[PDB]
Structures are given as structure tokens and as C-alpha cells.
Amino acid sequence: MSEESQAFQRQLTALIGYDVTDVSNVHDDELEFTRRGLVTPRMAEVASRDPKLYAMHPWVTSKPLPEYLWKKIANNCIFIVIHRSTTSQTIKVSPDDTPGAILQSFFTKMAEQDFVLRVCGRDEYLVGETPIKNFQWVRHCLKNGEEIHVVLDTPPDPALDEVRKEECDRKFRVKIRGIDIPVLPRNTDLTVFVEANIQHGQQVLCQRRTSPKPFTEEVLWNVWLEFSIKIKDLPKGALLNLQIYCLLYYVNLLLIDHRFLLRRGEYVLHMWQISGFNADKLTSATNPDKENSMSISILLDNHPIARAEMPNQLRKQLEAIIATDPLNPLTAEDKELLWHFRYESLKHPKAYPKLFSSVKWGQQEIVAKTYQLLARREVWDQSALDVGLTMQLLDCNFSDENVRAIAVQKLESLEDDDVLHYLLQLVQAVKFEPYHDSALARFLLKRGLRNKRIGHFLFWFLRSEIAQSRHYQQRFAVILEAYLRGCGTAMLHDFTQQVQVIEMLQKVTLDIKSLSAEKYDVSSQVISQLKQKLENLQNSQLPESFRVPYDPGLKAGALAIEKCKVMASKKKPLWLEFKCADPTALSNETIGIIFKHGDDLRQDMLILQILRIMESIWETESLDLCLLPYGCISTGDKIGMIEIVKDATTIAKIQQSTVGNTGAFKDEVLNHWLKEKSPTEEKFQAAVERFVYSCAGYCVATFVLGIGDRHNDNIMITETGNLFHIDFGHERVPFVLTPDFLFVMGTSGKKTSPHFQKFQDICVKAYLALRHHTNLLIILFSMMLMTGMPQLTSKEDIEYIRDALTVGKNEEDAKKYFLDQIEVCRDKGWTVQFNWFLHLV
Ligand SMILES: CS(=O)(=O)N1CCN(Cc2cc3nc(-c4ccc(N)nc4)nc(N4CCOCC4)c3s2)CC1
């Protein structure tokens, strides 16, 4: 190993936030093997990407322009304003024109072919054989009434992304020797026993238990648990799952290892505890806290895996089963039917989840048939990719390598635009794989290595988990380290900049929190210190300029200490504001950023990403709802950063305006506020139209997700009329449609108007459009719960969204169902809003 090979690794370590060379917390070599595993996939992707297209990372889409953005072009001409230090001619361009082509009507329009269109003030480029209509920046401008400003500069040097050079028919059994903990005490001395489970996709194949013994600091069984399953019948991916009840602790051991060997010998496993179902319960990882943790002691002494058409009436049984939602439970009868008509089931892609849930993975012979089933995958391969279908196959119910592989195979066809919409959930999905090295992991790896925008967000999603998940940090760590070793020194440098900045600011964030009371107001002394610490940082600490983690196009510069401050909550976040490092920016506006420790922002990351998905759906059907899913990113334990949405105010503060009489409200302030922050009437109406759409979209999306019952506090509006929700960390009312909201639309307690009809129509249109993807939202929503909450109910909590999306009904009953929910809100009015407060005291 080189002397500067080890300075590389230690560089990596500090980016990663966890040291993958460490081997204190392993009982085998799976991770190191996975580090060696991923060297090929990486060096193939790095070896195959186009240096030029890679360096500029054009953000791009095949989807058609939606209806509602073509109406912003009633002339088949788009305006691009090219710049050059001072001057700038506005060039007239057809939606189908290529970057190279509109340089051909720029240079030819004057009277050297190696310049490039770069977005003014961002690290964004308009390049490669793509029609300008198909660039996200362009579409972004069209959606906002913004104009397309572009600067004529040089392509950046690919050299900046140089990657460096790297370097039996016996029944299974298991002796349970005993357990041992240093300190247990609670109050009374209860009994205790161990429960071993052979598991495969949350599915217990077999289960034994010890006699109970009294819970002393060391309990010793010296007992064989003979299982019914046989060695050969054990399927790759099967977890020996040891648990301790008196349910206190758990730990898992793969029974077949990353080399197909049968796990044999002595193991002393350090167990996880339960904070008194979710994805943590599955992890192959042991508890690294060897000093406080409970530990179980086992021994394994036990290589392997070495015509007729249907009578049209059962077909209708099948087809009804196939027609049911992912959280519909399959009865035994269902499964015997599905399985017996394998080859008929195979002709329906949507059937696969339900079909492979009907495999008996506890028998070599049936699995061997399941493998033969998959061998003829001609209907699947040719099928159109369905994301929700494909996801279902990657959740916690499917531990089979090949079942899982076929889903990954379908993802291959996603373009980056789409990978980006699902990346976070695809990352969380890695928690569901049995082995560290998996098709899914090599895919994520490969797609972020292929495109810097995905790479960037891969990083932060991986690092979010590493920083706070004992259960999955080691695995992610290995995946991340795989990536860093091929993202190229350009970005290695950019990530280092970002890690430093956020490390500095979290120090300041947490340091400030101590200084103020747990809850009351703003100490002048705290505003005094904050201003010093940031003046301290600004000089000989803070990197000249960093990329904004949630918006890597934007390079932040120096702070605006004058504008930075501590917020007026109970956790004490930092309103921070930054100059923009790019001097070609068209504007003077600041990069706003909030920094917060106290809420688990991972939840907020996830909910925001759904919102983003919902918008991509409404994009398919020519709908625009003006959701404002702001940037939000986790960085560590109960901590991270949030995008500041310029010009937004709290609806609550709009009622605190005068008095806010501990919980009084007044209807017309919201419309009155809008008039004030509108110069014309023209811009005021444009607000009411936006408030109508935003109000609609947040009403629908929030209702679907169960998070619709919120306070005015956690809801904001921009000056330009765009309502939005904040703060998704964990009588009743479905969504906020308070009498103030209805007033802006032009109504007050049981009446109708030209704009209220518009709201109703949109919600309905919008609501319906989500239901077209019912399956997708359900699988997301359920994955969400499992990988991103405390503990939860694998049926009940999920069940809500099923009821919500009004599963199994017809468009009219839905139209009706939601139109009832509206009517609930106009009946309650303030009664719930006013309630928060009543409980404070
Ligand atoms: C007087 S003061 O100290 O200067 N300050 C003025 C602003 N006011 C209200 C706000 C609260 C709030 N909370 C969150 C938030 C978001 C997520 C989360 N998990 N937790 C909290 N996000 C906010 N957005 C983010 C979007 O862009 C605008 C700012 C806002 S604005 C408080 C007092």
C-alpha cells in the first residue's frame, strides 16, 4: 500500500463519516469482499462514461412538454438571452432546436465552434443532441414566467474529473449456549427466553424456543434447538433470527454466506435493543457497542445449492386476485391457485409480486421451479416498466436474488430524470437486500457514477444513513466508498467543501442551542454570540464557496452575517443567508438556508420526495399544482439543512398580524395580505389563481399521505400567492381548507363562486390522477413507513392510504368521497385550528 494510498483512504473516511477499513464489528469478511466486489462495476462505468457529457451533466428528459407549458408558447418560438460579460442579444428559437443548432443561428446571425451554453449563475449547461424543449432548466423557466438567460463560456476540463489509480438431509439445528449482559435492571425480575426463527422475506419458515430461565445478568441454556427444515431446503438469503423476550433484543445471522457457504462454528453476537415491522429488524449487522449491549452465544455445527389451458372460471379467480392491491393479503387458497397456474400467472406482469409471494422458499424443489419460471421471462422483459410494480419486488417480502434481480433489470431502462425521482427510495430499498453486494447496489452505484447530479444526491442519501443508522451504516459506507472512488477529483473536492461547511455550521447550531433556554424567545446575548461565531467562521475556516447540497447547481459564497440569525422556536434553528459565488448571476438575491437539530429530517426528506413524485404524475396528465417541495437534507443525528423559500410567510403570522388573540382568527386577512404584496391587480389575480392551484395540490397530496391535519404555523404562502406546507416530522380534519382560504377563492361558509368551482374541479382532477397510480403510492407509502419511522404496523398504518385512495371504487364515488372531505372542512372551519392552543394549556 502506498504512503499516499492511505491518505486517500483517510480522505474518503472523512467524507464518508465512517471507516470501512475497521473490522471490530464483523464476524466474517462480507464487507471487505463487497469492497472488492464493487471494483469492477465501478471501473466499468468510469471506463464507459463520456468525459465531456459527464463533465457538464446536462439535465434532460424524453417526456413530452405537458399541455400547460405549450400554452406558454403561442408562436412556436422560445426566447433565449445569450450573454458575454456585458452585452446580450435575445435570440428567437423554435422548441425543437438543438444547442449546437442555435449556436448555428447565433454565429451565422452575426458575420470558435467549441463554446457552450451555460445557465447564468449556475453550474448548469445546455448541451448534447437534445431539443431545448427537453432541458429541465428551460421547462423550469417556462413554468415560472422567467426568461432563459445563458452565458457563452468554455466547456470545463474533463481532466478535472480524473479518477486516480486504485488497488445434506440432516435437519438444521443451532446450539444456544446462553446470553450475557452487564447491566439489565428495571424494577422487578421477570423471566427470559430465546426465540430462533429461520426467516426469508419477513416469512418465518420455522421457529423454536428455549425453556425460560430467570433473567439474571448471565443466562445459560447449553441447548440444541433442532428445526424441522433440512439443510438442502435452506434458501440463500435466509436469516437465522435470534430474539429475546421476557421482546427486548434481536440479532440476525445469514445462514448462507456471500460465498454460498453454510455458516458454521462459534458466534457471539451483540444484539440490538427495542425502543419501547420495520427495516432495522432485518439487518445482518451486529451492535457495535460491545460494552452495554446484550450478547447471545451460539454454535452452528451443520456447500449446498450445487400445454394445459385453464377452465375460464378459475381464470376469473386468478384475474381477480391479480387485480388486487399490494396490501391485499393472499389467502392460502389464493397462493395454491397462483402457484398451480404459474405459467398463466407469468403472462401478467402485475401478477409477479403476488405470485412470488406464493413460492414456498422453504423447499429446494419448488424454488428450482421458480428459477425455471424466471428462465422464460419474455412477457416481463418486453413489458413497459412499471415503477410501483418493480418496487414491490424490492421490498421486504422478497429475499430471492433472482426475483429481486428482475426488478433491477427493469430499472435499467429509467432515464436519469426518473432515477432522480425515485433515488431516495431506491437507496432506502438497499436495507431490504439480504447481502451487502446486490444488483440494486451496483445499480445505484452505476447510475450516480454515470451522472453527477445523481452522484451528488446519492452521496447525501448514503451519508444521511451512515451518519445515523447503526444498523446499516457499514453497508452504505461500503457502497458510498465505492462511489467516491470513481466520482472523479472534481467532485471529491466539491464534497469535501460541503462536508466542511456543514460540519462547521452544525457545531454552531448545537452550540447555540445549549446557550438559550429550552423554550423562551430570543436572548440578545444569543444573537450576540451567533454573530461572533459566524464572523469567526467567515475568516479562517469557511471554504471560499460551497455547492448547495440540496441544489448542486447553486454555488454559495460568503455569508451575509447581517441577515443570519437564530429562529424563535423551542429547538433553535439558524436562519442563514449566503451570497452567490457565481458573479454571472442575473440577480442579487441570497441563498437562504435553515439549519436545525431536533426534528428527524429524514422523514421530511422522504415526504418531500413523494410530493416531487406526485408532481411528476400530474405532469403525465397535463396537470400543474404549484407544489413547493423545498430542498431539505439530512446530515446526521436529528439534524440537517432546509431550503429557504424566498418571500414566504407563515399563515399563522398572517393571523398574528394583530393580536393573534391566543387563538382568535379573522377570515379576510389572507386576501388582504395578498393585495398588499401585489403592486397591480394583475399580479393579485395571478396570486389567487396560484393560491387556488397550490391550495388544491396541497389539499390532495396531503390528504393522500395522512399528514393533512396541520396547524397554520406549519403552513406558508409566498408573496406571489403560492401556498405550501412545512415540517413533516410526525376530533380531526382531512386537510386545511380554513375559512380564510375559502375567502380568497371568494366564499364563506356554505356558498359557491367561479373560483371555488375551479378548486373543486382541480382537486378532483388531481385526486383522480393520483388514483391512476394507486399501486405506486401504496408501495412508496409502505416502504416509507418501514425504512423511515420508529416501529410500525405492517398492515394497520399502511392501511390508511388504501382507504384514502378509495381503493376498489369507481371514479364517481371517488369524485364524491373527496368532495365530501372538502365539505367536512367548511363545516368545522376554525374548530380544529383554534384547538391547537387549547391543549398547550
Ligand atoms: C423571527 S424569525 O426567527 O426570523 N423566524 C421567521 C420565520 N418564522 C416562521 C418559519 C418557520 C419555519 N419553519 C420551517 C421548518 C421546515 C422544516 C422543519 N422540519 N422545521 C421547520 N421552515 C420555514 N421555511 C422553510 C421554507 O422557506 C421559508 C422558511 C419556516 S419560516 C419563524 C420565526
Side-chain angles (χ1 to χ4, degrees), residues 2-166 168-841:
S2 189
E3 221 262 48
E4 254 266 42
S5 171
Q6 266 144 358
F8 191 57
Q9 188 65 43
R10 124 185 163 168
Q11 177 175 172
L12 298 171
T13 310
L15 284 156
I16 291 164
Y18 173 102
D19 161 51
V20 298
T21 74
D22 189 46
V23 308
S24 55
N25 197 41
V26 298
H27 56 250
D28 67 348
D29 76 304
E30 200 192 339
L31 299 141
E32 239 299 300
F33 182 91
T34 312
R35 283 176 57 194
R36 296 208 225 77
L38 306 161
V39 168
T40 276
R42 154 169 68 263
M43 291 184 315
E45 189 46 60
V46 161
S48 57
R49 73 192 165 188
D50 182 30
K52 249 181 178 158
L53 291 165
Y54 179 67
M56 290 178 283
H57 65 279
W59 192 4
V60 136
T61 183
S62 299
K63 293 142 197 63
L65 255 178
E67 280 174 66
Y68 58 86
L69 288 181
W70 268 119
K71 108 287 172 194
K72 211 248 185 171
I73 325 167
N75 59 334
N76 201 248
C77 147
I78 282 167
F79 296 82
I80 314 301
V81 189
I82 300 161
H83 285 35
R84 248 302 208 188
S85 48
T86 302
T87 55
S88 44
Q89 197 70 16
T90 307
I91 277 63
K92 239 135 71 168
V93 164
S94 164
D96 311 70
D97 292 4
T98 274
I102 60 190
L103 292 155
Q104 210 186 339
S105 66
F106 183 83
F107 289 114
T108 325
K109 202 219 168 178
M110 256 61 180
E112 220 145 38
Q113 299 285 342
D114 52 64
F115 287 87
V116 68
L117 296 193
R118 194 203 73 162
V119 175
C120 284
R122 301 183 137 285
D123 232 81
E124 213 70 54
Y125 296 78
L126 285 22
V127 248
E129 312 309 23
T130 317
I132 51 103
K133 85 181 188 108
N134 286 5
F135 283 91
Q136 275 297 156
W137 183 245
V138 182
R139 298 205 184 194
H140 162 68
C141 305
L142 294 164
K143 199 228 200 212
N144 282 254
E146 267 184 1
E147 323 171 316
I148 306 97
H149 294 90
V150 165
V151 90
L152 176 80
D153 65 345
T154 330
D157 194 6
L160 307 182
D161 317 288
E162 164 177 31
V163 176
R164 83 174 296 170
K165 314 197 202 196
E166 295 192 38
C168 196
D169 282 303
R170 167 60 68 89
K171 294 165 174 177
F172 164 93
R173 64 192 214 144
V174 54
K175 172 155 265 182
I176 301 308
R177 315 214 80 125
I179 53 164
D180 222 294
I181 190 162
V183 287
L184 57 91
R186 341 99 302 209
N187 206 336
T188 324
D189 52 338
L190 219 250
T191 191
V192 123
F193 65 86
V194 167
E195 181 187 288
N197 300 311
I198 312 297
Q199 276 187 12
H200 191 275
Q202 281 236 150
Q203 204 187 68
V204 303
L205 306 181
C206 231
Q207 160 173 131
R208 294 293 174 283
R209 282 178 176 185
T210 59
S211 45
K213 282 179 141 49
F215 195 15
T216 79
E217 300 101 330
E218 167 188 69
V219 201
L220 281 169
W221 285 278
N222 187 33
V223 162
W224 288 108
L225 304 166
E226 181 143 62
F227 280 90
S228 54
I229 300 299
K230 295 192 202 167
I231 301 321
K232 243 36 159 65
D233 296 327
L234 284 180
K236 186 163 204 200
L239 297 186
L240 175 48
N241 163 259
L242 302 147
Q243 311 198 152
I244 280 158
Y245 303 76
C246 36
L247 176 72
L248 305 166
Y249 308 91
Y250 62 89
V251 66
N252 303 317
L253 191 68
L254 291 176
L255 287 157
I256 301 159
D257 87 354
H258 55 281
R259 278 198 215 73
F260 300 86
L261 298 193
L262 176 78
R263 184 133 297 159
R264 205 185 77 126
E266 300 287 353
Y267 291 82
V268 170
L269 300 156
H270 277 271
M271 302 178 75
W272 306 97
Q273 193 180 26
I274 291 290
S275 47
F277 269 54
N278 86 30
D280 290 337
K281 278 199 44 41
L282 311 198
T283 185
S284 79
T286 52
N287 197 358
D289 183 338
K290 286 198 165 60
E291 198 176 40
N292 281 340
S293 71
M294 161 72 72
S295 72
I296 187 161
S297 300
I298 75 182
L299 161 64
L300 269 14
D301 192 9
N302 285 301
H303 197 267
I305 324 175
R307 212 204 161 174
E309 188 67 9
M310 291 184 76
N312 93 103
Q313 225 78 74
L314 291 179
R315 153 166 279 98
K316 279 163 167 170
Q317 248 188 66
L318 201 91
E319 281 190 52
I321 279 148
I322 288 167
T324 49
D325 56 86
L327 304 172
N328 176 66
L330 286 177
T331 311
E333 216 250 304
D334 301 359
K335 290 182 196 156
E336 287 187 14
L337 208 272
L338 252 343
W339 172 250
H340 195 245
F341 308 108
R342 268 114 76 174
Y343 288 99
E344 204 43 56
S345 306
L346 198 124
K347 293 173 180 141
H348 304 243
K350 301 222 296 251
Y352 283 41
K354 305 249 189 69
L355 164 64
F356 293 106
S357 301
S358 316
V359 173
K360 283 174 186 301
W361 303 96
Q363 298 184 227
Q364 181 154 242
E365 262 169 33
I366 277 164
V367 163
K369 297 184 159 158
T370 315
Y371 282 9
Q372 293 149 36
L373 246 202
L374 294 165
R376 46 213 283 187
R377 229 189 299 150
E378 311 192 49
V379 171
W380 177 261
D381 293 345
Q382 280 140 29
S383 80
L385 179 64
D386 181 330
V387 175
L389 206 230
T390 315
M391 297 295 248
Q392 285 177 59
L393 289 194
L394 303 169
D395 78 2
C396 61
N397 312 86
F398 301 96
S399 312
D400 189 87
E401 175 180 311
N402 309 289
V403 176
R404 288 188 69 102
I406 67 158
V408 165
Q409 167 244 160
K410 231 73 226 294
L411 299 170
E412 296 295 328
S413 84
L414 291 160
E415 63 182 11
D416 297 323
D417 184 46
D418 291 309
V419 176
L420 278 155
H421 283 95
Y422 301 112
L423 179 56
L424 159 53
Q425 255 106 359
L426 290 155
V427 166
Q428 300 291 306
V430 170
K431 300 182 188 181
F432 298 134
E433 293 278 330
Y435 296 90
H436 294 315
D437 196 342
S438 58
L440 187 47
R442 299 199 177 195
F443 166 77
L444 297 186
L445 204 216
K446 175 191 290 140
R447 292 306 294 276
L449 273 186
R450 196 186 288 146
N451 160 283
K452 299 189 165 190
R453 184 168 170 94
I454 282 154
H456 173 89
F457 292 88
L458 187 53
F459 191 88
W460 288 104
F461 295 155
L462 297 189
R463 187 165 219 286
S464 158
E465 285 318 305
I466 281 171
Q468 29 196 320
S469 170
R470 306 257 72 177
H471 300 88
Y472 289 99
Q473 79 208 148
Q474 310 170 276
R475 162 183 283 167
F476 283 133
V478 175
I479 286 159
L480 209 206
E481 179 238 29
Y483 170 54
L484 296 172
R485 291 173 161 285
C487 61
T489 54
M491 317 211 54
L492 287 164
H493 167 92
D494 299 53
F495 293 122
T496 303
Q497 297 280 298
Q498 300 159 56
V499 183
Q500 276 173 12
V501 174
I502 63 104
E503 274 175 327
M504 289 173 193
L505 296 170
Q506 289 179 318
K507 280 190 203 206
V508 180
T509 306
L510 304 154
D511 287 351
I512 259 63
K513 204 174 186 210
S514 314
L515 290 162
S516 60
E518 173 50 40
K519 202 267 182 55
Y520 57 101
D521 310 5
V522 184
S523 204
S524 47
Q525 191 182 323
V526 156
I527 256 292
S528 196
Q529 291 237 173
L530 181 268
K531 294 281 188 149
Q532 292 168 188
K533 272 205 261 301
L534 294 165
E535 205 197 315
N536 282 1
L537 285 182
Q538 191 76 284
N539 216 50
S540 277
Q541 273 278 66
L542 208 149
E544 291 270 332
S545 48
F546 62 102
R547 269 195 209 297
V548 186
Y550 61 67
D551 184 351
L554 258 178
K555 293 219 77 162
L559 289 145
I561 297 104
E562 322 72 66
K563 297 166 184 183
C564 316
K565 55 198 186 297
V566 168
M567 256 169 271
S569 163
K570 331 89 211 322
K571 18 274 207 188
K572 307 278 180 173
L574 315 183
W575 190 291
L576 307 185
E577 298 196 59
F578 290 73
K579 274 155 188 179
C580 172
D582 204 337
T584 53
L586 231 91
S587 186
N588 308 172
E589 262 178 358
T590 57
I591 295 156
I593 307 188
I594 295 180
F595 258 91
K596 153 97 103 176
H597 155 82
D599 287 331
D600 187 46
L601 263 18
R602 274 180 304 178
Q603 275 145 85
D604 303 48
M605 272 202 297
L606 228 42
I607 303 298
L608 265 351
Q609 201 49 28
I610 277 170
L611 269 53
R612 280 189 198 80
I613 273 146
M614 292 193 173
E615 278 192 328
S616 84
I617 279 158
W618 296 332
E619 203 197 305
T620 59
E621 323 211 358
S622 301
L623 256 165
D624 179 28
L625 287 297
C626 301
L627 300 186
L628 230 30
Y630 52 76
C632 174
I633 288 217
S634 229
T635 35
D637 184 30
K638 294 192 274 70
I639 190 166
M641 78 215 304
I642 296 162
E643 161 167 1
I644 297 196
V645 156
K646 258 52 213 58
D647 288 297
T649 327
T650 286
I651 268 74
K653 198 149 166 194
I654 291 166
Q655 302 273 2
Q656 292 145 28
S657 146
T658 322
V659 199
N661 214 178
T662 340
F665 305 115
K666 11 179 184 164
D667 292 1
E668 308 195 342
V669 185
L670 223 190
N671 199 261
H672 262 122
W673 187 82
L674 284 165
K675 182 71 190 68
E676 190 208 56
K677 302 305 199 202
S678 280
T680 72
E681 245 273 338
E682 188 181 46
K683 294 190 194 202
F684 169 64
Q685 298 289 7
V688 176
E689 221 80 9
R690 205 161 205 74
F691 178 76
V692 156
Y693 281 93
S694 57
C695 192
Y698 275 104
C699 292
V700 164
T702 208
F703 177 73
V704 168
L705 293 162
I707 63 165
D709 196 321
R710 306 283 265 125
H711 185 30
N712 279 331
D713 198 308
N714 296 108
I715 299 176
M716 316 179 82
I717 196 181
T718 68
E719 292 200 18
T720 193
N722 201 331
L723 188 74
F724 65 119
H725 273 225
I726 44 159
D727 203 19
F728 307 105
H730 280 339
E731 274 193 10
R732 308 262 152 164
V733 74
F735 43 77
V736 174
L737 184 47
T738 33
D740 56 324
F741 288 27
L742 297 159
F743 181 81
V744 169
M745 294 158 174
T747 316
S748 44
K750 310 291 84 160
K751 213 200 144 289
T752 316
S753 82
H755 284 295
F756 180 58
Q757 291 167 195
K758 205 148 173 32
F759 171 67
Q760 285 174 296
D761 287 319
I762 297 156
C763 300
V764 169
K765 273 177 189 150
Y767 179 31
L768 295 173
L770 292 189
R771 300 179 49 237
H772 287 113
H773 303 266
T774 285
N775 263 45
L776 214 210
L777 303 178
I778 280 166
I779 221 316
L780 296 189
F781 183 96
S782 92
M783 279 186 179
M784 189 185 64
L785 301 209
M786 290 187 301
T787 62
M789 305 295 150
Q791 207 173 37
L792 64 300
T793 337
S794 292
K795 292 144 274 300
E796 215 215 23
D797 292 301
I798 340 296
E799 221 80 326
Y800 167 86
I801 199 167
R802 218 136 84 73
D803 294 38
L805 284 169
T806 228
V807 159
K809 314 317 198 65
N810 64 288
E811 290 197 340
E812 311 312 287
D813 280 343
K815 182 179 89 182
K816 157 164 191 66
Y817 182 51
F818 199 85
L819 278 169
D820 276 305
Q821 304 299 352
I822 291 186
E823 287 288 298
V824 180
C825 300
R826 318 218 295 123
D827 282 328
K828 267 104 202 318
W830 293 116
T831 289
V832 164
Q833 278 302 149
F834 143 85
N835 260 27
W836 193 115
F837 273 131
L838 203 166
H839 302 328
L840 284 221
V841 201

